[PDB]
């Protein structure tokens, strides 16, 4: 049943703009940087694999971190505390069976106490004022997947893959909306695999054309070519598993003809 298909997509489009983090938050952060955030997201990816968490959960946690860091200064010593509660919150929202608080304490080698993780949780909810139901790349991609002819599991898994790589790099992907990144990734996956293009039916659905996606696609395309040399390798590893049709082993296309 694509029962409320349009309506929901329309509602996600409106919400993605309001749930968008500040594009510059990192300039105003005195004690942290883009690569430190890359290191945290990478680690959150391992946490997701370790605990067998949904992809939606990881994507949600990231959105929290960025939004929380769009308004609160954090020290190097605490970026990870914020990171852990963001994930605990993500799991509680999204997971049939979230790991216990203790587990989140444990996966830091006990850097912080349970008492601190719950206090950060509270603090994170305060700052987000409980707006946790944020649209994500994974939510758009999943709808777009309904537009393929026919369903291709490689296309899907490889789309998740690229969608996921964008989480890691604030510069540049904090300036692209979830729906656009998903646009870039879906198109990029399809072309790699079957050699085909952003379908005309999604141009109708979304109002995006190859043209409108070019900029994010240009970035996504580089990110893909350079993937195997990135300091962060947890997504790539994750995406080797049969679970994802080993898509991280496929070769990026050397050109995009745009």
């Amino acid at each position: 049943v694509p029962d409320y298909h349009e309506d929901i997509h329309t509602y996600l489009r409106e919400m993605e703009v309001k749930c968008k983090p500040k594009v510059g938050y990192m300039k105003k952060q005195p004690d942290i940087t883009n690569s430190m955030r890359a290191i945290l997201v990478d680690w959150l990816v391992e946490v997701g694999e370790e605990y067998k968490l949904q992809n939606e959960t990881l994507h949600l946690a990231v959105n929290y971190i960025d939004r929380f860091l769009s308004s609160m200064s954090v020290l190097r010593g605490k970026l990870q505390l914020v990171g852990t509660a963001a994930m605990l919150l993500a799991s509680k929202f999204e997971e049939i069976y979230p790991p216990e608080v203790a587990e989140f304490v444990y996966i830091t080698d006990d850097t912080y106490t349970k008492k601190q993780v719950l206090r950060m949780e509270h603090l994170v909810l305060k700052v987000l004022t409980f707006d946790l139901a944020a649209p994500t790349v994974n939510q758009f991609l999943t709808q777009y997947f309904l537009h393929q002819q026919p369903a291709n599991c490689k296309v899907e898994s490889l789309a998740m893959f690229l969608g996921e790589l964008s989480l890691i790099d604030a510069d540049p992907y904090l300036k692209y909306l979830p729906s656009v990144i998903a646009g870039a990734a879906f198109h990029l996956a399809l072309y790699t695999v079957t050699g085909q293009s952003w379908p005309e039916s999604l141009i109708r659905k979304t109002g995006y054309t190859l043209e409108s996606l070019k900029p994010c696609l240009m970035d996504l395309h580089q990110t893909y070519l350079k993937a195997p040399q990135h300091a962060q390798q947890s997504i790539r590893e994750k995406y080797k598993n049969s679970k994802y049709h080993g898509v991280s082993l496929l070769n990026p296309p050397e050109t995009l003809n745009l």
Binding site: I39, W43, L79, Q80, T108, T111
Partner: peptide, 5 residues
């Protein structure tokens, strides 16, 4: 893993 060491 402790992260920022």
């Amino acid at each position: 893993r402790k992260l920022f060491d």
